[PDB]
Amino acid sequence: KDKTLEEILEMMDSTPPIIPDAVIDYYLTKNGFNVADVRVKRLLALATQKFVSDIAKDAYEYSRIRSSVAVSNANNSQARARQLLQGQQQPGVQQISQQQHQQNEKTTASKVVLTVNDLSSAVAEYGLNIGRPDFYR
Amino acid sequence: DKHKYRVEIQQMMFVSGEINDPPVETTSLIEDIVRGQVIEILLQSNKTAHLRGSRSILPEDVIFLIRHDKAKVNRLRTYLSWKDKLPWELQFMFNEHPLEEYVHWSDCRQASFTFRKNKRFKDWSGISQLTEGKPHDDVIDILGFLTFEIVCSLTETALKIKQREQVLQTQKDKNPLKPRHIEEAWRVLQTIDMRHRALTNFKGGRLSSKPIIM
Amino acid sequence: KQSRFLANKDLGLTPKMNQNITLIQQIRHICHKISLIRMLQSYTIIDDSLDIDPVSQLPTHDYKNNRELIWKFMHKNISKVAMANGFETAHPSAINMLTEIAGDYLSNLIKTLKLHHETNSLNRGTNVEMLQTTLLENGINRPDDLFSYVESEFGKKTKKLQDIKQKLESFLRALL
Amino acid sequence: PRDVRLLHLLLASQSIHQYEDQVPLQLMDFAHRYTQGVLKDALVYNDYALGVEDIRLAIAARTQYQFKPTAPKELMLQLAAERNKKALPQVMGTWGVRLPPEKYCLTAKEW
Amino acid sequence: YKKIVMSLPLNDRNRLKMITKEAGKRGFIFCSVFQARLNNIPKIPIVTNPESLKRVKSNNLKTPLEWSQDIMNGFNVPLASESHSLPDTDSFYLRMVGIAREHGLVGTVDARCVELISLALDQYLKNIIEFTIDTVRYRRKKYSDYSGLYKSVSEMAADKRDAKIKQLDDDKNEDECADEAKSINNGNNSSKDDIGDISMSSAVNEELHENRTISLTNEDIYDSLSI
Amino acid sequence: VCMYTFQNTNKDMSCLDFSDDCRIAAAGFQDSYIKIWSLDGSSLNNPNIALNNNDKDEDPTCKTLVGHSGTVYSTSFSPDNKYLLSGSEDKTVRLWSMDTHTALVSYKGHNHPVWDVSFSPLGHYFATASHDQTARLWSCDHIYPLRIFAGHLNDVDCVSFHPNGCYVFTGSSDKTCRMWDVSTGDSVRLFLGHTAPVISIAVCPDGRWLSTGSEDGIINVWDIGTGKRLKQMRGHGKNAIYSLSYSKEGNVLISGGADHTVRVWDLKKATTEPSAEPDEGDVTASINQDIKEYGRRRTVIPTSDLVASFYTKKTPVFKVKFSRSNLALAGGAFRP
Amino acid sequence: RKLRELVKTVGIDEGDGETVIDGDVEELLLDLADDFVTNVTAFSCRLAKHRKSDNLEARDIQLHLERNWNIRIPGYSADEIRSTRKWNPSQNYNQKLQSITSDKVAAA
Amino acid sequence: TPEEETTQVLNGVSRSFPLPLESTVLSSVRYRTKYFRMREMFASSFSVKPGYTSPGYGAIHSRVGCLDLDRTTDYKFRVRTPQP
Amino acid sequence: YTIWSPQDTVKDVAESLGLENINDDVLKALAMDVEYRILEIIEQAVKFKRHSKRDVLTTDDVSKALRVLNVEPLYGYYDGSEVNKAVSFSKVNTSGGQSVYYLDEEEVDFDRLINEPLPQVPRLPTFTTHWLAVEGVQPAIIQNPNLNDIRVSQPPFIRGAIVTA
Amino acid sequence: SASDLNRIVLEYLNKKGYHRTEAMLRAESGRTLTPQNKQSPANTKTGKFPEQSSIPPNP
């Protein structure tokens, strides 16, 4: 059964969200509308947290598609797990490492960077247009 | 030209609801809607795959455009299970991984859009017109499954709004689908979601967006 | 004196998000060991008890309504959720834009509920209906999906990272 | 950059001698997005029928909904004349401030 | 003067360009009174160019005596504020041919773009009405996969005119919906466009008690009140 | 001049105002508060001898008012001094009760930010300035406006009534100001001659002379009958003249601007009214601006109307308010 | 009486309530539609003149409603309106991106 | 010398003023049609008393624009005025 | 021309789309309209600056000339420790036949953004009063200026004419 | 260009229906200054309060 709002506030009575009370209080008194219920503050905290979880997750999808290293790791995942499983004790190393070195300097040197040219497309899905040029001439 | 896929459009209409021999105009409008949707799918997927640095469109690159509908991509994964690992998933962040007419109801479901060969599909939809490379590894099978889902969902909502317009007409004074039913089914299926609008609501500027694919 | 910001820092979603974060980090560490195995076959833990200082918690200071302290707590609580997906490094401008987006979304939520509270139309909704329509008109299309998200991010993702940890631990035990 | 100091000369040409640092950066990132959208819509309008009348169509397409409208004084004069038909109501004569009725005030409300 | 540190690192081509600009580059106008005048006046297309004269004489399109009548007949349509109903095909056709004669198009207006305009108005007003409807109510059965009757008021179509402000033409219509749609409680809305005068509170004047029967101007407004 | 300097405002305090009896000060912040100061160090809690509870809270003789969602750009006190009228950049003007510290009425008639609210002389009905190039007449009992004052080319910056409450004066950013009939709505006077956005306007208690200041540091006076210029005032720096105030009985203009000075002006020097000059010299006169170390064209030359100028040492004056007894009050924020 | 039918097909009961309209809202939405019609056809006439013709065809109106308002009417002439460019940059731009990436890797 | 170059650069920047190529005048349908209708009634009502000519064309009888068939992107045009 | 760009800025966005060669009349008229729109932003920015009672043109004075002119918002010009002119114009040249500046930015970890301490917060506002003048002369308390160091501090266009009673 | 504005003013008055004597007298009325009202802030000997008659103002 889909949860009614009173059940959600009764659960927010026990489990507070990530964004604490005073941040919600500052954004309240910045936008007017002084409210004295702590459960409405926790509900708006959970709503903002869920919305930015969705935006940052869509940024994660846009940053894992737009790199060849990630799609090649997803393609050759168990194919290189075969090579790792055949990477036994030292008799049995000479028949491997024909492909291990290049993706070794690719996959271990690649960290996932939340980028402006990634988030701008992840929120251009959501209605924005964050146009930052790449040089200024 | 047009009117190439009329009998197959009728076959896919039969699986959703009753058929009652739909006219030339409904099949023509569904053909033009699907021909537009395929071009938009190919343009968005080619734009996504060129920036990776590979003109060959991968099979996962078109599942990228429908990544929100988890039930539909689970349906696609079960549909790819009779031919006898997504890059954006939770496991694939980290670097290393461990080790009597019921038969007539069924044969219409086996009838597909591009099941036979991609000969009429390639010059009808124009695969070579906008793709810079050679995408055909499994992009045609997904581009058949997506059009089957588009026609099924479109005639489902057109049937439901035809029934609701019927009860509105019999309540106002007190069989076939038309172009107006397909157009208002399109208007129902092309409304932007509320979460994909939230960040432009208090500022006043005309929302430019993309055609939502089913 | 404990400030009011660090009140619910262990109360039900911050320990679960911390467990998600440390599971992500300690299965990003086994991958480094197996990558070291691949090389031979040729950490900075979290801290949430950071307060301001006891001199600025005095009631002669506006430690509740100035821009920069709230902006720093938004920055911390948004970098605490942009790493539960899988990010581990970011540009500064990306987190700055994401904090601006979260600030504008929360301000739009409060502005919509404010506009529903003080409208002079001949049909005002009740206490629960205004909350439901101010959740609807910006973000979530139903109330229930919040409980889905708490189910999705702290009830499903935690066992996903847990059994990924268990399988990688058994794989490391099977390698050496 | 050439356009940071060109924006310095533009800001100084309109007597703006105190500003922050990211203000010409914001002006450049506005002008980039505006020119990119205008040229994309103009490429559409040139594939339809580049040239200057094409740019005129592409910047008349979006003048209609974002920037400051042109010569709005006669429409505002017409609108004022529609509002200034009604004579003024009767005022209180007890030399103070009178409120609206109680339902039209922000007091009989509940959380 | 004092900008030697800044005006010097511009390159030589840029400075040789920017010691040449002036006023008198254009052929434009900038007097806003004159811009409003040219947006107000009705204009008819004329011909002086000989190639376009033989191009318009070949396709049997007429002289400006017909386009001026088409301007007048496109203006004389009972536009949709007066009729309180959405317009029909003949009204659409006459208004669009009058507008096309205003802009210069001396050809013929197609018969399918009228139906396209009809469906455009349909989806435009359906978007506006739907995002006014789902704000006075939370439809629990909708927006989900498992009270009574409300009328939308003008204050509500001002209240969700701003919570979702992107949905409008941003023309005159939104300006009047923001400016004049909200009425104070002494507004006297259910009226006959004239009964909000001050003299309709102060007594109908009677007639013809005079040899020359010249009357006063406070009786002329009672005379025009009846019509 | 008694100067009220506000200290810990990190450039986020807009224009303020003092009440009459000078007991309450109201300052509009950039983060959507109205801050209310008791200028006497009083309680400002309005206890009403019952005195129920809540000494546990912290009262620093200062109350905050949170009803706006935009930045408060103007604020005006009633002559009754019991109500406050705050105009913001969210498109409302709100009304506050100064004896229970809550909001009473929201006033929605604008679609652009509100820049200058001002009550009537008799407190009947308030006029408003906004970015939409129109001024609007209101009433405190009506939610929506009563008159629309349209006819300016740019947006309206300042608004003020005639002291009888019968005309409205609006100055706008297209180098001009106008006098509006309050009943028929249409403009009666248009005053031309400035060279900058008119930012503060004020009409003398006589009523025959109008004075206003622009962002060029030049004040000037016209007479409302002829509509042309009597004279101008050229002593401020090439900068903004934030406020303006008049002597209670007679004509002495007090201008508090942006160059950190509060200047004093004789209105009756170059006119046909000489206003009783002394019969019989100085040393500092006509040598201070005869130093001109910075250059003749790069300096200001004051009119013969300017007599004194009190500098404030690095705080600017947002408000001048001439009280009844030859004591003016200035007010501003300590800037660094 | 047509606008009551339009709100009728928008707001039905559907087991959750019927929303109706009032007369002042009808005059407001009729003025909105009245200005929308002229605002569409006045730019469509400029597009049809930009196409160097004299007739006002439906491709002008469908293009003007696709690009700006994005109403997305299904096909009347929506195969000529659908223009497909890939919006990939020039060869100077990818050269300058190579220079920027080369400086970003030579900085470390 | 850099001094004359700097003063002539500042002379160049002090003389450049932009206009917009396309500006959409904020107006109405209804006030335009009602202006036209009232002007048509009171233009058909009275006479002209010309010196040599009257303004207007067929069934306008007022000040009417003279936009050409070409140059529809021009910013100004001629109007009709009673010439003596 | 006007002072924005003949081709050197607008053309490098024209190439960002893909458009190879277009005439200089297009770029002339287009850049003229683009910097007219820049001036149209700047004028509402100085209006918001004047009505916010300030002298600099901060980044939130042009970001409120955007919402007024309905422009989509330029996010990412406000960060932690918001000081006046938080210096960030470190744009790095890149060579060629012409100049290219690309605004280098250093990447950073997340665990040095969550394990980073909170800044200082000042006191809440108070006021303090004194006498600026008692009879038209200034009493020369510590709170008054000196009227001779007003010469050596500010030029007479931002301080006006000094006269005394 | 102010004498041409004076001529435009005179032709405007002539076409908007002001007699030559009437336009001359309105010009002479427009030129002279507003004289002095000796009861300028309404001194409390010969000055009165405004009426509290519940009507709006009218100039």
Curated annotation (Swiss-Prot), chain A:
* One example GO MF annotation: molecular adaptor activity
What S-S linkages are listed for this chain? none
Listed A to Z, the keywords are: Nucleus, Phosphoprotein, Transcription, Transcription regulation
Biological process (GO) annotations held by this record are: chromatin organization; positive regulation of transcription by RNA polymerase II; regulation of transcription by RNA polymerase II; RNA polymerase II preinitiation complex assembly; transcription by RNA polymerase II; transcription initiation at RNA polymerase II promoter
Recorded GO CC terms: nucleus; SAGA complex; SLIK (SAGA-like) complex; transcription factor TFIID complex
User: Where mainly found?
Assistant: nucleus
> Can you tell me where the transmembrane regions are?
none
**Residue stretches in coiled coil:** none
Any idea which residues bear Phosphoserine here?
77
Give its localization.
Nucleus
- Histone-fold domain location is 1-125
Q: Which domain of life is it from?
A: Eukaryota
Q: What is known of its domains?
A: The histone-fold domain (HFD) mediates heterodimerization with TFIID-specific components TAF47 and TAF65 as well as SAGA-specific component SPT7.
Family note: Belongs to the TAF10 family.
Q: What does this protein do?
A: Functions as a component of both the DNA-binding general transcription initiation factor complex TFIID and the transcription coactivator SAGA complex. Binding of TFIID to a promoter (with or without TATA element) is the initial step in pre-initiation complex (PIC) formation.
Spell out the subunit comment: Component of the 1.8 MDa SAGA (Spt-Ada-Gcn5 acetyltransferase) complex, which is composed of 19 subunits TRA1, SPT7, TAF5, NGG1/ADA3, SGF73, SPT20/ADA5, SPT8, TAF12, TAF6, HFI1/ADA1, UBP8, GCN5, ADA2, SPT3, SGF29, TAF10, TAF9, SGF11 and SUS1.
Q: What else is known?
A: Present with 3400 molecules/cell in log phase SD medium.
What's the name of its gene? TAF10
Swiss-Prot record, chain E:
Annotated region Disordered: the residues are: 167-198
Annotated membrane-spanning segments are none
Q: Where in the cell is it found?
A: Nucleus
Q: Which cysteines are joined by disulfide bonds?
A: none
Q: What does this protein do?
A: Component of the transcription coactivator SAGA complex. SAGA acts as a general cofactor required for essentially all RNA polymerase II transcription. At the promoters, SAGA is required for transcription pre-initiation complex (PIC) recruitment. It influences RNA polymerase II transcriptional activity through different activities such as TBP interaction (via core/TAF module) and promoter selectivity, interaction with transcription activators (via Tra1/SPT module), and chromatin modification through histone acetylation (via HAT module) and deubiquitination (via DUB module).
Quaternary assembly: Component of the 1.8 MDa SAGA (Spt-Ada-Gcn5 acetyltransferase) complex, which is composed of 19 subunits TRA1, SPT7, TAF5, NGG1/ADA3, SGF73, SPT20/ADA5, SPT8, TAF12, TAF6, HFI1/ADA1, UBP8, GCN5, ADA2, SPT3, SGF29, TAF10, TAF9, SGF11 and SUS1.
Q: Which miscellaneous remark does the UniProt record hold? A: Present with 7950 molecules/cell in log phase SD medium.
- What is the official name of this protein in its record? SAGA complex subunit HFI1
From which lineage does this chain's organism come? Answer: Eukaryota, Fungi, Dikarya, Ascomycota, Saccharomycotina
| Chain's gene name | HFI1
UniProtKB/Swiss-Prot annotation, chain H:
Compartments, record wording: Nucleus; Cytoplasm
Q: What else is known?
A: Present with 486 molecules/cell in log phase SD medium.
Q: What does this protein do?
A: Component of the transcription coactivator SAGA complex. SAGA acts as a general cofactor required for essentially all RNA polymerase II transcription. At the promoters, SAGA is required for transcription pre-initiation complex (PIC) recruitment. It influences RNA polymerase II transcriptional activity through different activities such as TBP interaction (via core/TAF module) and promoter selectivity, interaction with transcription activators (via Tra1/SPT module), and chromatin modification through histone acetylation (via HAT module) and deubiquitination (via DUB module).
How does it associate, per the subunit comment?
A: Component of the 1.8 MDa SAGA (Spt-Ada-Gcn5 acetyltransferase) complex, which is composed of 19 subunits TRA1, SPT7, TAF5, NGG1/ADA3, SGF73, SPT20/ADA5, SPT8, TAF12, TAF6, HFI1/ADA1, UBP8, GCN5, ADA2, SPT3, SGF29, TAF10, TAF9, SGF11 and SUS1.
Q: Which family does the UniProt entry place this protein in?
A: Belongs to the ataxin-7 family.
Could you tell me what this protein is called? SAGA complex subunit SGF73
| Native organism | Saccharomyces cerevisiae (strain ATCC 204508 / S288c) (Baker's yeast)
Tell me what gene encodes this.
SGF73
Q: Which residues of the full protein are shown?
A: 353 to 436 of 657
Curated annotation (Swiss-Prot), chain I:
| Residue ranges of domain Histone-fold in the record | 1-68
Query: Membrane-spanning regions, if any?
Result: none
The subcellular location is: Nucleus; Cytoplasm
The UniProt subunit note reads as follows: Component of the 1.8 MDa SAGA (Spt-Ada-Gcn5 acetyltransferase) complex, which is composed of 19 subunits TRA1, SPT7, TAF5, NGG1/ADA3, SGF73, SPT20/ADA5, SPT8, TAF12, TAF6, HFI1/ADA1, UBP8, GCN5, ADA2, SPT3, SGF29, TAF10, TAF9, SGF11 and SUS1.
Name the protein family.
Answer: Belongs to the TAF6 family.
Task performed by this protein: Functions as a component of both the DNA-binding general transcription initiation factor complex TFIID and the transcription coactivator SAGA complex. Binding of TFIID to a promoter (with or without TATA element) is the initial step in pre-initiation complex (PIC) formation.
Its domain description in UniProt is: The histone-fold domain (HFD) is required for interaction with TAF9.
Kindly give any further remark recorded in the entry. Answer: Present with 6506 (+/-1290) molecules/cell in log phase SD medium.
What is this protein called in UniProt?
Answer: SAGA complex/transcription factor TFIID complex subunit TAF6
Task: Give the organism, scientific name.
Answer: Saccharomyces cerevisiae (strain ATCC 204508 / S288c) (Baker's yeast)
Which gene is this protein's source? TAF6
